[PDB]
Structure formats: structure tokens, C-alpha cells
Symmetry: C3
């Protein structure tokens, strides 16, 4: 059938052969049937969603099979054939809950290469497939092996720098999409979608399955599942809630340290320091005369609203 | 006597023989007198709190003295004999105000290894014993020597990366305790206690002599001296105060960008955005009828409190 | 005329001979005419603001022209002579709008080396001259080139770590000024001015053309153009933002506070309080009410204590 996705990866395994991570240089969404037919017999792929380990020899074969069909992939395979690290072919017949770590990594790659957008893909059950890993300067290292490797580096006057201990590596160690700035890359997870024209500044954060249409200036905290529309600036220290699908529309503005726990419609402005939850009582104002006191949940998705705290009596107000 | 602690360390010295840092693989709290009597004569240890430099030969001899008593410490010492860097034995009669950099480093390891909790160890005067150092990809570097190594690195088209300039290195460059996640390890200082079941997210920060019993979700800032009880979740960019001892009890919830300048008893909730210091006048409420106006200090360490801001008139309230 | 600046730089080029960055070890402000008199003709400098690429040969001649004149610079050039990277001599006649990346970098170094203070130097138009680059453990890398090198590292079980993708690099990969602590150096841009006695903690941030007089404790966000006077502490996650927003001497800014007006000396601001020009504040005296003004009219005033009333949510200023 028409496969959902396929990618040839080079990854890391621990001493018991558990996959810790996979690097895919050139993942493909909706690969052509020609590529799939050319590669399936060599890998032993028949059907379904499979993570298939392949040898250096198979890499040479696959590189030949795709000379004539896809040069970019062929060229990748020739490099992969000389790898000092294990290779895996991830062929997905369908977009379903991931069943292996390799697949988990592939889907996070589809997001960060921008080939798919937040919510587009099934990520259910991803957490148990992504091992807790020490991310270090020499690569992913198993937690049960790390202590020894740390000591060993010290004996040489070197340092094994461990810059993250988590289930998700930082995005930019796998892919840097075009038209993007990320001041401090520890704050953008693999699986984040950083739209063309987005600057993530140092206080900005973007989790997996979340991000920006682009352009925009992101200095706040975009949580898992939160998408942000084009031309929307997030002030330093602000937050989106990590239930209805939270999002930020196009043209929006979000002051520093502000917190939004409901969807914001296009062209919304939010005041610095202000917090809005679903049950936040707001005074709805007009052209600014009072109308009525409603909960923020009932303004969810509305365009051109301006959320500000009244500095004199502390009342939260929405000027239409 | 019953030593308070001992540890065999490999460290780094500058050109004038001042210690910059020490790495202890296997620090011991209350070592057995068997180990001490096996080690003391070979080092020249009589009494007191001493940081004794030892030679490669002594390392062999110490391993040889501890084969049969403690095989882990023995295995460690034989690795240290093959070191390219200077060794130090730190034997402490008593938990006292630190007198050497080696001793300052050891006490920080006792915390981060979870062998003692915050407040259990004496850290008075630690700041002048911890040199201000440049932490780089090649290790710790004396600030006076740094410019030369920076320039020289550039001449080869390489980079000497300088990721911190401080008295406290990051905990994970020394130890990753079991059952822990720390998304950005630059925000956890050596000397932090990160309990089993803790997830420090990217905005989470944990200073020395501070941290979590575990489990927990730390997306806020745990200041020095601040301990956080089990099952207590700190929101995005919230703060504790770094006087009475500021702590957070068990099963607490602290909302994003809230501040707590008073100790919180068990099962306390604090609303996101609310800032409560000792002299914060709170409208104590009941099963939500009013009662009186008290200062937050008087409600310190009380169980099952709910601190919030009135979104209609700005008043700070506590709901029992 | 008298040169405003000169520095001998080592840099990184991509394949279309574009300059990604330059590392100046010993930048000189107002270099003696002696030093200049020796170096200009060997390089072919006539006048104006010039970034003259120069060779390994010239480095030997320029070390020789400065033997007996400036020992630090002579030693610098003998090392540059052995460089495996393209070298640039950056001679500036005046402090004018930057025109090249070499010059842009240099102007950031003058700030970070503390040789000039924020606002004292012309950076108009610097943004386009600072190419967007992946900052990696191996050095600055062209974005167009990065994917190949990322792959190649992985084939050897290595990692090409990309720790920043920005037009500015982190200050500390170029210079660490004396008497300074910076917990997380990803949060201080080349171009920042971190004055003696400053500790920037982990939640602290300083942009370029901004910083601290020193001494100070900066746990908050210091935006471009913002300068913080001596003895002023900034709390965790606090923010500074047209009038040039400054913080005076001996100020205290609470956690997550926001100052959108210039703060006079010895001002205290409560944690979580967000004050902008339009913020309406209950002005209190010696604490009886006096009137309600906008914060803009309290801008620059010394000895003010800003706090939010916990009983009615009013912003209050106690004089």
C-alpha cells in the first residue's frame, strides 16, 4: 500500500541492545511506491509498521537499488554503509500509535523537519518508548553505564559533559530547519515545529508536538500540543497550558510572564503579568463601558480581544 | 574515631597548585573504622578534617589495602592510580565549617549523591573555598589562564567552549542520581538533592543545599536551603525564598510564576501569579465566607491551605 | 587622524568566502599612533573603516613591526602567524554605523572587553552584518553546510552538538571579563557589558549593548540598551523593557517584576508587580494617600518603594 512514512536511520544502542535514539538525516512522508518496492525485499519488509535493523552490506545494496530511483536517498545509504553505529530502516504503513523507539524518533523527526504539523500524527504511548537517557558530548549514553564513563574521562583530564538527562533530546542535534533562530537550543525539544521566520529567544521554550506557524518571536513557553499562529509574539517568561486543544491564533501578542490557559483567537493582545484560566472572571468592555462579567472560557476563539488588568482595582478586563 | 566522611577524589589544579575542583566517584558517609584504619597510615592521617594529596604509588597501595574490605573502593583506587590528574584523600573527623576546596567539594557530593539531605551538613563559609572557575568542554580552567587557551583553540579552527563561569559546577558533570530527569542540567548545581521520582523541567532550577524528596515536577526555582516534600509540583517560573527555614511540604501545588516567601505545610495549593511574603495580608475564608485579615506568616506551615487572588477586586485569600 | 579602534582577528569563513565570525583576543581602543604607524603600510591601510583580510606572511611582518613597540600585540601576531584560519585586521578611523561583519564583531568585543560602555558605541545596522550561524562544539558552522557535518559526526559515533542558532554568539566563547560570575553563559550575548562584581545567575539574561555597572546580582532579564547601576540586584525572572529604560544604583527588583520605566536610585520593586508608563499608582507619603498618577511621572525618582496592596490590588508607591 501507500506507506505513511519511511526513513533510514543511524542510532545508538546500549550494551543490552536497547535503542536509545535514532538519527534520521532524510525522513520521508508518503514515500513513492517506487522507493518502497526497490527497498522492501532487501530489508525483509512485508507489511505494517516495522523498525528493521540492517547491516552495512544491506546499506550498499539499498544504495544501489535506489541509484536511478532516488539519488538523495541513495547518497545517504552510501554514507550509512560506512557507519560505525547501528542502522535501522523504519517503514510505516500507517500513522498509528508508535510501537518502537525508532518509530517514536521518526515521528518526532517528521514534526521537526516540518513535514507534518502538530496534531497531524498519532503519538499516543510515546512516553514509554523514549528511554530516559543521559545526553552528553560524545552522544546518548545509558544511565546504567554513565558513572563508569564519567570516571574514565576524569582519569584522562577530560570531561564527559552531561547536558541533559531526559526522554527527549534537543531538536537541533538532529535537525535545524531553514529560516529559524533558536538562541539556546536546550529549550527546543525534538518533535517541536519551528515555523519559517520564528526566533526562539533564550527564555523561549517549545515542547514536542507543538510550535509555530512562523514568523514570530517566541520568548515564552509553548507546551505539548500548543500551536501558535503566524505573526504572533510571545513575551519573555509567558506560558501556555500543558481538555480542549489550546492554541494561539494569528497576529496575537502575549506580554512577559503572562499565562494563557484557553485558546486565543486571531489578533488578540494580552497584558504582561496577567493570568487567564478557563474559570477566570473577566469584565467584558465595549467601544470602555461595561457589558457583563463572563468566564474566559466563553471568549475562547474570539478575535481582536485585549486582556488587561485594571491597575486601580485589580479587575481583569476584556476590551473588544 | 567514627569519621563523618571520607572520599578518594581525582581533581584539577591550576599552575600554582591551587585546587579548582575534585571529582569523587564513591564518597562515603560514616565510613567503617575498618576502611579508615586500613587507609590512615598510608596517607599520614592522624586526626581532624584533612585533604591529603596522594601519589600514584599510594593509590596502588591503598587499593591493595582495601582488597577484601571494600572491593568497590578498591576497584576505584586502582583506576585512580592510572590517572593523568592529581589525587586527594579527604578524611573528615567531623561535619564542620569547611576549611579546604576538596572538603567543600566532598560535602556538595554528599548532597548530590543523596547520602545526606539539605541542612544535614555544615556548609558555612563555603563560598570563599570554592574558586570562581571557567567550566569548559576540556574541564575546569583557571580564569587567569583562560584567555590563552581560548585564543589557541581558535588558531586550530576549534573552540574552547565556556558554558559556566562560577563557584558551583553543574551536578550532572559529577553525578546523575538514580530515577531522575533533568531537562537542562545547567540549572541544577552540584550540591542539589534530586529525589527519586523528580522531573526538573527546563525552567526548573535547583541551587545547592536544596531540592526534592521526590517524586515531583519542578518547573520553578528551588532556592538554596529550600527543601520540597514528596508529590509536590512547582509550576513554570515560580519561586521560593533563598530568617525562618523556607520549605514546601508534601503533596503541594504551586502555580506558575507564583512566589512563596513562607514555609508551606502539607497539601497546600498556591494560585498561579500570587506572591505571598511573610507580611502579606490575607483574607482567611471558611467552608467561602469571610473570617478575618491575618498576615501570611501566621498561616505558615498550616496543612490544606488554598492561596488565591480575587479576579474581581484583587484581594488575596486563603480557603481552608 | 586618531583611530577609534584596531584589532587583529582570527575568524571563520564558509565556502562563498563569507565571514561568519571573528575572534579578537586583544582589541585596542584608541590605539597609539605608533602602533598604527607601523602596521598600516604592511596591510595597505590608507584611511576610513576597513576590515583588511591579511596573510600568514604579514603576521610575521606585523609581529616584527611591533617588536619594540607593543609586546602584547607582537606576541599576539606571532601566534596568528601560525593560524589555520583566515586572519582579519580591523582598523577603524571613527565610531560610525558598522559596514562589515568583521567590524560588527569588533564593536561587540569593545563592549564585552569593557573597553566601552553600552550606548557609547555605534551599532546602527549591525543586525544584517551578523550572519545566522549554528554555534557548535567544533565552531561556527554555515547553516547550508550543517546537515552534512551532523550526519558525518553520527557515522563515527560522535555528536556535532548545536548549542545555539543565532546571529550572536555567547560572550564567554570570546571573553570572560575579570571579577564576573555567569552561571549559564548561554544567557549572555557577545556585546554584553558585565561590570566587575556582577553575578549573573541561571535565570539572568543580558543582551548585547546592555549590562551592569557592577557590583550586582542579576537573576532577571536585561534587554538591549538597558544598563544597571552599581549595587542593584534583579530578582528571578524579572524583566526590563521610547525613553531608554535604565535601572539606577542600589535598586531592588523582586522576582518576576516588570519595569517598563526608568528606575531612579535606591528604588525597590515588589515581586510580581508589573509597572509600565501607563500604570496608575496610588502615591503614598511618609502611609496616607496623596494622589493617583501614572508611573511615567515617577520615572527616575530616587528612593521609591513600589508594591501591590494585597487587600484591594492597587499598585502603591511609598515615598
Amino acid at each position: 500500500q501507500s506507506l505513511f512514512s519511511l526513513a533510514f536511520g543511524v542510532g545508538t544502542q546500549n550494551r543490552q541492545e536497547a535503542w536509545l535514539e535514532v538519527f534520521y538525516a532524510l525522513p520521508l512522508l508518503k514515500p513513492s511506491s517506487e522507493i518502497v518496492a526497490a527497498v522492501a525485499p532487501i530489508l525483509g519488509y512485508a507489511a505494517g509498521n516495522q523498525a528493521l535493523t540492517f547491516t552495512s552490506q544491506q546499506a550498499y545494496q539499498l544504495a544501489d537499488a535506489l541509484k536511478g530511483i532516488d539519488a538523495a536517498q541513495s547518497a545517504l545509504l552510501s554514507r550509512l554503509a560506512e557507519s560505525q553505529k547501528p542502522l535501522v530502516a523504519t517503514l510505516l504503513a500507517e500513522d498509528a500509535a508508535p510501537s518502537s523507539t525508532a518509530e517514536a524518533y521518526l515521528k518526532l523527526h517528521l514534526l521537526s523537519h516540518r513535514l507534518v504539523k502538530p496534531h497531524a500524527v498519532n503519538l499516543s504511548g510515546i512516553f514509554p518508548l523514549l528511554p530516559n537517557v543521559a545526553w552528553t558530548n560524545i552522544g546518548a549514553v545509558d544511565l546504567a553505564e554513565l558513572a563508569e564513563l564519567q570516571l574514565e574521562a576524569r582519569l584522562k583530564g577530560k570531561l564527559l559533559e552531561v547536558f541533559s538527562v531526559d526522554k527527549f533530546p534537543k531538536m537541533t542535534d538532529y535537525v535545524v530547519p531553514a529560516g529559524v533562530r533558536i538562541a539556546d537550543t536546550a529549550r527546543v525539544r525534538l518533535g517541536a515545529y519551528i515555523g519559517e521566520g520564528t526566533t526562539v529567544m533564550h527564555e523561549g521554550f517549545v515542547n514536542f508536538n507543538a510550535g509555530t506557524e512562523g514568523p514570530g518571536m517566541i520568548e515564552g513557553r509553548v507546551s505539548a500540543g500548543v500551536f501558535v499562529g503566524k505573526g504572533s509574539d510571545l513575551g519573555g517568561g509567558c506560558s501556555t497550558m500543558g481538555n480542549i486543544v489550546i492554541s494561539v491564533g494569528e497576529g496575537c501578542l502575549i506580554g512577559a510572564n503572562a499565562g494563557i490557559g484557553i485558546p486565543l483567537g486571531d489578533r488578540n493582545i494580552v497584558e504582561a503579568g496577567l493570568y487567564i484560566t478557563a474559570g477566570t472572571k473577566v469584565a467584558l468592555l465595549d467601544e470602555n463601558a461595561l457589558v457583563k462579567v463572563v468566564k474566559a472560557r466563553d471568549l475562547a476563539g474570539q478575535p481582536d480581544l485585549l486582556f488587561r488588568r485594571n491597575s486601580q482595582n485589580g479587575a481583569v478586563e476584556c476590551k473588544t
